[PDB]
């Protein structure tokens, strides 16, 4: 399924989509590329809209 992140950092906002199996996998690709770009933050996961977010 398609799962969206909502980058709502000090430096880097926006949004981006992957394809996943499943939450757990979603959640890996997008805290791996939050980490990678530098944001570090609070999140949340809504399952209803399949949507992550990152908060700084």
Same mark, same amino acid.
Not at 1 to 15: A, H, P, R, V
């Given at each position: 399924?398609?799962?969206? =992140?909502? =980058?709502?950092?000090?430096? =880097?906002?926006?949004?981006t989509?992957?394809e996943?199996?499943?939450?757990?996998?979603?959640?890996?690709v997008?805290?791996?590329?939050?980490?990678?770009?530098?944001?570090?933050?609070?999140?949340?996961?809504?399952?209803?809209?399949?949507?992550?977010?990152?908060?700084?």
């Open positions: 399924g398609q799962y969206k =992140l909502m =980058l709502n950092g000090k430096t =880097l906002k926006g949004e989509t992957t996943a199996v499943d939450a757990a996998t979603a959640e890996k997008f805290k791996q590329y939050a980490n990678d770009n530098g944001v570090d933050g609070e999140w949340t996961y809504d399952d209803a809209t399949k949507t992550f977010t990152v908060t700084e």
